[PDB]
Amino acid sequence: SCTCSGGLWQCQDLPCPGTCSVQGGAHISTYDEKLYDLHGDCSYVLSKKCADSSFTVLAELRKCGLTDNENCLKAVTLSLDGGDTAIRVQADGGVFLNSIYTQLPLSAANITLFTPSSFFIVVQTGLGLQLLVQLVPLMQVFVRLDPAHQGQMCGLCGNFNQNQADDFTALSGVVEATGAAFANTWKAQAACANARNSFEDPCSLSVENENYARHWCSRLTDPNSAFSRCHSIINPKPFHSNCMFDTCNCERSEDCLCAALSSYVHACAAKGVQLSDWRDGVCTKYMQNCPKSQRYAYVVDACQPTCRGLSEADVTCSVSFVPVDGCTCPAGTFLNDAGACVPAQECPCYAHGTVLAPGEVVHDEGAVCSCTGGKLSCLG
Amino acid sequence: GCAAPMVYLDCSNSSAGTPGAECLRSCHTLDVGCFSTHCVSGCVCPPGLVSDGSGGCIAEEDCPCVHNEATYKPGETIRVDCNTCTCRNRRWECSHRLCLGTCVAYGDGHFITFDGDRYSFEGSCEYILAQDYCGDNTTHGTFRIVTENIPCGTTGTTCSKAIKLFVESYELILQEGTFKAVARGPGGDPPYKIRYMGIFLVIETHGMAVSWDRKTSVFIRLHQDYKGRVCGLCGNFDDNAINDFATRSRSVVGDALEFGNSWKLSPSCPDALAPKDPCTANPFRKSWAQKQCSILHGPTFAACRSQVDSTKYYEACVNDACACDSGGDCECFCTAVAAYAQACHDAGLCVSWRTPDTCPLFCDFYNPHGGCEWHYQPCGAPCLKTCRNPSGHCLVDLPGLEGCYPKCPPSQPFFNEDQMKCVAQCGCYDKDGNYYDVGARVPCNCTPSGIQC
Amino acid sequence: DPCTANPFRKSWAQKQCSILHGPTFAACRSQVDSTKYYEACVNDACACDSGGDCECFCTAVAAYAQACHDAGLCVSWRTPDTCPLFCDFYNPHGGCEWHYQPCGAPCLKTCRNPSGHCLVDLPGLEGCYPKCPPSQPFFNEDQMKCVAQCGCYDKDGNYYDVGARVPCNCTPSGIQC
Amino acid sequence: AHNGRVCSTWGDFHYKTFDGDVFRFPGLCNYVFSEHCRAAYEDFNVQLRRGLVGSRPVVTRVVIKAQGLVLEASNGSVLINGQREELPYSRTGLLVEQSGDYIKVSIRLVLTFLWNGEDSALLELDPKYANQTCGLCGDFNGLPAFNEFYAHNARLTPLQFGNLQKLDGPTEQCPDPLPLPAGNCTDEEGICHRTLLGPAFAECHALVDSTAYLAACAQDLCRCPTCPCATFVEYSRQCAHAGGQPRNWRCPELCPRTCPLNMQHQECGSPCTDTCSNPQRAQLCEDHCVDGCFCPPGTVLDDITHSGCLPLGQCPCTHGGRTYSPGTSFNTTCS
Numbered sequence A: 001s002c003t004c005s006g007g008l009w010q011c012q013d014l015p016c017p018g019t020c021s022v023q024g025g026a027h028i029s030t031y032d033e034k035l036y037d038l039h040g041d042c043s044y045v046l047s048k049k050c051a052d053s054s055f056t057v058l059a060e061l062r063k064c065g066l067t068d069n070e071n072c073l074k075a076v077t078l079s080l081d082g083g084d085t086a087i088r089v090q091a092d093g094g095v096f097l098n099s100i101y102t103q104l105p106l107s108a109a110n111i112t113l114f115t116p117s118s119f120f121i122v123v124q125t126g127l128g129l130q131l132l133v134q135l136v137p138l139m140q141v142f143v144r145l146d147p148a149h150q151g152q153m154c155g156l157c158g159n160f161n162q163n164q165a166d167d168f169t170a171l172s173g174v175v176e177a178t179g180a181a182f183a184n185t186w187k188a189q190a191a192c193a194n195a196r197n198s199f200e201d202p203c204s205l206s207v208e209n210e211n212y213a214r215h216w217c218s219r220l221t222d223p224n225s226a227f228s229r230c231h232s233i234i235n236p237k238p239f240h241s242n243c244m245f246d247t248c249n250c251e252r253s254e255d256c257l258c259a260a261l262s263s264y265v266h267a268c269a270a271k272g273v274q275l276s277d278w279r280d281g282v283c284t285k286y287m288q289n290c291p292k293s294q295r296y297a298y299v300v301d302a303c304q305p306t307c308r309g310l311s312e313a314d315v316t317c318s319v320s321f322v323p324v325d326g327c328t329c330p331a332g333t334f335l336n337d338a339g340a341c342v343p344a345q346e347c348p349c350y351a352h353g354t355v356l357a358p359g360e361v362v363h364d365e366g367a368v369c370s371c372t373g374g375k376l377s378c379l380g
Numbered sequence B: 001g002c003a004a005p006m007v008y009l010d011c012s013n014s015s016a017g018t019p020g021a022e023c024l025r026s027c028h029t030l031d032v033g034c035f036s037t038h039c040v041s042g043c044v045c046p047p048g049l050v051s052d053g054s055g056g057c058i059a060e061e062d063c064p065c066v067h068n069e070a071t072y073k074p075g076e077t078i079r080v081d082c083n084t085c086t087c088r089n090r091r092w093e094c095s096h097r098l099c100l101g102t103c104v105a106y107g108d109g110h111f112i113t114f115d116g117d118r119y120s121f122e123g124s125c126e127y128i129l130a131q132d133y134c135g136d137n138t139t140h141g142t143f144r145i146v147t148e149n150i151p152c153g154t155t156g157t158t159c160s161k162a163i164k165l166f167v168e169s170y171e172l173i174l175q176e177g178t179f180k181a182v183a184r185g186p187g188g189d190p191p192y193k194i195r196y197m198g199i200f201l202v203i204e205t206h207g208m209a210v211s212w213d214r215k216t217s218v219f220i221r222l223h224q225d226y227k228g229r230v231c232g233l234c235g236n237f238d239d240n241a242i243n244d245f246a247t248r249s250r251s252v253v254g255d256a257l258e259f260g261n262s263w264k265l266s267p268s269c270p271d272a273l274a275p276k277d278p279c280t281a282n283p284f285r286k287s288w289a290q291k292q293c294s295i296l297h298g299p300t301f302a303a304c305r306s307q308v309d310s311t312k313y314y315e316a317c318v319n320d321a322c323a324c325d326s327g328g329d330c331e332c333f334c335t336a337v338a339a340y341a342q343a344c345h346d347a348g349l350c351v352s353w354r355t356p357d358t359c360p361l362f363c364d365f366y367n368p369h370g371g372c373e374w375h376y377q378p379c380g381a382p383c384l385k386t387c388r389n390p391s392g393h394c395l396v397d398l399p400g401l402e403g404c405y406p407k408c409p410p411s412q413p414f415f416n417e418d419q420m421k422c423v424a425q426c427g428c429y430d431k432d433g434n435y436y437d438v439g440a441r442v443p444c445n446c447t448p449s450g451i452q453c
Numbered sequence C: 001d002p003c004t005a006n007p008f009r010k011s012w013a014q015k016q017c018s019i020l021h022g023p024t025f026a027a028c029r030s031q032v033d034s035t036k037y038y039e040a041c042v043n044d045a046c047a048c049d050s051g052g053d054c055e056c057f058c059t060a061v062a063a064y065a066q067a068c069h070d071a072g073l074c075v076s077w078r079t080p081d082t083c084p085l086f087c088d089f090y091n092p093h094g095g096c097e098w099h100y101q102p103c104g105a106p107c108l109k110t111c112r113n114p115s116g117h118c119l120v121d122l123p124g125l126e127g128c129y130p131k132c133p134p135s136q137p138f139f140n141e142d143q144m145k146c147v148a149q150c151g152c153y154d155k156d157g158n159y160y161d162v163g164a165r166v167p168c169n170c171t172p173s174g175i176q177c
Numbered sequence D: 001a002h003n004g005r006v007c008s009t010w011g012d013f014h015y016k017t018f019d020g021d022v023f024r025f026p027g028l029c030n031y032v033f034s035e036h037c038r039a040a041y042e043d044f045n046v047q048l049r050r051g052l053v054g055s056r057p058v059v060t061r062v063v064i065k066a067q068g069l070v071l072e073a074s075n076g077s078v079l080i081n082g083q084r085e086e087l088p089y090s091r092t093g094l095l096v097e098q099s100g101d102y103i104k105v106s107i108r109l110v111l112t113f114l115w116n117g118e119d120s121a122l123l124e125l126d127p128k129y130a131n132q133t134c135g136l137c138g139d140f141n142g143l144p145a146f147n148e149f150y151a152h153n154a155r156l157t158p159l160q161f162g163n164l165q166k167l168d169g170p171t172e173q174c175p176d177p178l179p180l181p182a183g184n185c186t187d188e189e190g191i192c193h194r195t196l197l198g199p200a201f202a203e204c205h206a207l208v209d210s211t212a213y214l215a216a217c218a219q220d221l222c223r224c225p226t227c228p229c230a231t232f233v234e235y236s237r238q239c240a241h242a243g244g245q246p247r248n249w250r251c252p253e254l255c256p257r258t259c260p261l262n263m264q265h266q267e268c269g270s271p272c273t274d275t276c277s278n279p280q281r282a283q284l285c286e287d288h289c290v291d292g293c294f295c296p297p298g299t300v301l302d303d304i305t306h307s308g309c310l311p312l313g314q315c316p317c318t319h320g321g322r323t324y325s326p327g328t329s330f331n332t333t334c335s
């Protein structure tokens, strides 16, 4: 916050949770905002409070094509309590709690897992870090840190100390030179192959890939585009480079293209701008592919409205996360335990875990109760 | 079923989940700690050792240290920036000498500020490249550096620069190929020193050394004293690159255009509009540009590409070679590559690209009639025994940098810049810095002492 | 016409080609007519709108340079600011045979021509030559250096070191067997 | 001559690489036919898309990218940097023509691309791209049998090799063609052995081995019996390119050719047809045999008015856009 005084701007800082991210399966934006490319095939320690083993976010990046520089993120393995717990979010959406399938939501040991929409999974922990993982159109990861851990972390996302020249500090006490040379010090398994520096732009290969990627990714830097509202805040040049590189290199050009556009939108919305309606004539197959009875939404900024939640509250909705977009039930509707989207009148109040049907007067413990609009009331 | 001390380990007997050959204690994974849900059978060193990664067994206190894709055996030393590290117990112990901060202002407007941030700004007016004249007290600050883009033959795309090195009450204008002096304030001795460092004018102030390639690139190297107390287009030197876009009123912006527009000297000057991407503007140059800029990926710069990240340098080269559509293309490409050349030179490497086909440098020119002192050295001596500095010592010892230097023989051991020649006895410089031959009166004569009377 | 096509180069072109009217080429302008050379210089500097400008201007001026060389003069323009020619390149670690001469020797005691004679004795012309000392008096083109003894050239003109077999060996005589 | 700097695509998806390998890969989409892919900066990128005319395997589009120039040949038309052009189109270093029976794109010091427009397509490359290329045309290192089909030390098969060098469109997912079942037919009547081993290619046996060509001939014989001569024509091209002088194997039944009235179809005629615009062009030519239409020796081609081949003494002259018949004179004020 900056006040206009003394002929200048008097600027103080509100505390800011740091934000790491891995987008396109290759690009990494650290806590110091040192964007760098990583074409590797191993499990890399994405972030770790390298004083202790309190938490350890791991990311498994896997080569996805003929070219050595064709990568996709494939998993996010939050190790915890020194490896005692491991929450592994795969790329299909499957969530493994201690290598066991666990549907969503789940709330235990202060850890809360839930899907704000069909595109994202939120792994909120009390240790300080929050993971927000994207599955649609492909796999991307975002990490938020309570600024208390400033200047303490290690790993790929850098030590979070407001210095871009120290981000490549390795465990040997020197700043590494380039991205891949730095990453190959943080591999999980000694048997992995070292990442290699990539100069050859895949954009130069196919002229049709060229024109496609150009004509679409140029929507970023267009001053009349929906994205212009964030131009005066976030410089879109790295995002445009990401979109170019992805779409040219991606076998599913639309998937990586829309992943890049979603990444730009989500970063800007993290900075506090609500970019909306940017999918004009583009990425609409992600409008349509929604699960039945759900619908798209551009500003999903809370939990998912559920019949159980409106009946008996929910731990889920007590987590603050950047407003992501995706598929959710529309307002005025709720999804029952069956998952289908019905209005409040069609979903039941739940007492002691008992399905108590809507608009139904019942007797319990010398009391008379009613289930009006999914809301439970008791008298006497 | 192995040969060297490392023996086979099989997961059939062990309960599922043990750290197998994949989680082998190794010179790298000894420290991070290995993760694997699937055991794999393979040959693993006996307890108390690790592997070299090639099938050997080595003690944990001799594991080679890896730096920048290289591998170094213990007992090897490396040089990072201005200091030297040595590999011991899988770590680097480095000397603790302070290293000068570096700002780089070159090309069509690329800047690499002190804190390592990089951006591009195409400004046309005078812009404060640095100053101490920003603070709750402006008057305890000393220096100030402004630059602006000169076109050398037209009014079009930039061809050179114009620097204004103020130092307290002095002043030095750098334009058109050499320096000047418009000292207006108190007339003491110079708080600066001037030297011909290869293809650079280098001006020191005992803590602040400015190097100008004489066409369009300025590299400024500051002592660690000025940390956090400077401003302008080289950031505020705070080791915090996110907020280096701090304008005149210190309202950190996410845009380069506003940050550049803030530091214009004269508010009457019009703000620069949106910079335009060169290669898009003139596609018919792009191919040539890439073919010219591809020098950065070729085996000429194979070694340095592992020591210095060359992505943004390549983007700058291609942008500049695309932009210069009004004349002087070789200079644009030459300086775009030479910024990376100096990055390599400072990092650890004496790279010498500069082929007769590619960015040639005439250095026989100052060789008179078969004299062969003047030779092209890719990294010049840290200090020059110049005519102006007969001592041979220097204040801000710059490392090697490209250009050609004279190998002044003992018979003629004085390098004179005002004639560019190795000679026996030097002349004289006055207060303003003009030169005369010995035995000449000055507007006192010139003698072995110099200007005396 | 080039300058009409690209007027925004035109000014620069003239500034670059004005080298012909300057004191650098004062003397030759009275020995060789330079109207058409100047027109060619300006047209070439105007035309090269796709890259490689200094080469265009350099060769346009160097044709006049050679005309002056052939007429009667040894003119040396080639300033480090203007059309430089890296000739320190073939200098090995301080060895300083390679010097730039504005007018070269009529014939070169080359590796291929050990005799030192020539068939068409050409006059001086720009370029840098090695002052091959008596200790290493043979100029070898394939490596560009002054050397003590030469190797051998086959019929097609490929070069090998002494003592190396050709697809016979190499000796002081040459390729023999 | 053009010993090992040639590759080709002919007939039923038959690919001949630089170093002599022949195989069959029945793809149906775009593939990187050749590309400068082991250098700091690419020089050429030639790709083909192979499709069907009813049943005949054809090339439906070629895209040659080179040094900032994009050339897309398809639908009997040529696109230069996105614009249709009328053949021939010539520029510094590049010239594209409807020469002979094909469309030829020659980029000087880079490549030579012949494309009959229906099936065949042949690349000549400079020697300087040795070992720095990769594609269906092979590695251009000179070793045929050891380095093409060994990816990550694993030896692989024509289907695998032709599928590795694949490239989909921006919004296209082309499948991979499945292996074709066993063969039949073979060379029963011996036509492939009668012709290929016949006198016409005697010295061609000394240069290019016909085993793969024999097999391809048999395989095409399994296909339509109006399309068996593609292998023969390809063998003639290869024999010509290795340096040898092929002989006229054609007969009024063996895929006969037709040429204009004064003009004859020859195998291995001089590529530089003497034309009384330059009636002694063929004097010190350096180019191997070329198949096509020609003129009988002694009478040169008439390109001034396109009257066929005329004797050296009866063909017109030209002055300033004017064509002068023989016997005509024109007097300037001075001559």
Ligand SMILES: *[C@@H]1O[C@H](CO)[C@@H](O)[C@H](O)[C@H]1NC(C)=O
Residues within 6 Å of the ligand: A108, A109, A110, A126
């Ligand atoms: C949260 O963490 C604390 C400390 O590990 C633990 O004791 C507690 O059971 C966890 N859950 C809740 C709901 O506090």
Ligand SMILES: *[C@@H]1O[C@H](CO)[C@@H](O)[C@H](O)[C@H]1NC(C)=O
Residues within 6 Å of the ligand: B136, B137, B139
């Ligand atoms: C420096 O500025 C402060 C106000 O910020 C003022 O009180 C002080 O007197 C100034 N000192 C000098 C030496 O100007």
Ligand SMILES: *[C@@H]1O[C@H](CO)[C@@H](O)[C@H](O)[C@H]1NC(C)=O
Residues within 6 Å of the ligand: D075, D076
């Ligand atoms: C080729 O283009 C022509 C028009 O120029 C069109 O009529 C025809 O259908 C196209 N395809 C073929 C195979 O001729």
Ligand SMILES: *[C@@H]1O[C@H](CO)[C@@H](O)[C@H](O)[C@H]1NC(C)=O
Residues within 6 Å of the ligand: D130, D131, D141
């Ligand atoms: C050809 O390429 C291979 C591939 O690495 C290389 O090992 C070999 O040395 C090269 N040889 C030549 C003659 O280019």
Ligand SMILES: *[C@@H]1O[C@H](CO)[C@@H](O)[C@H](O)[C@H]1NC(C)=O
Residues within 6 Å of the ligand: D329, D330, D331
């Ligand atoms: C010039 O040529 C014309 C056309 O043949 C002819 O009629 C005329 O007589 C000629 N002039 C002479 C012969 O002086």
Ligand SMILES: [Ca+2]
Residues within 6 Å of the ligand: A032, A158, A159, A160, A161, A162, A163, A164, A165, A166, A167
């Ligand atoms: Ca940091």
Ligand SMILES: [Ca+2]
Residues within 6 Å of the ligand: B115, B235, B236, B237, B238, B239, B240, B241, B242, B243, B244
């Ligand atoms: Ca800062």
Ligand SMILES: [Ca+2]
Residues within 6 Å of the ligand: D019, D138, D139, D140, D141, D142, D143, D144, D145, D146, D147, D148
């Ligand atoms: Ca091969």
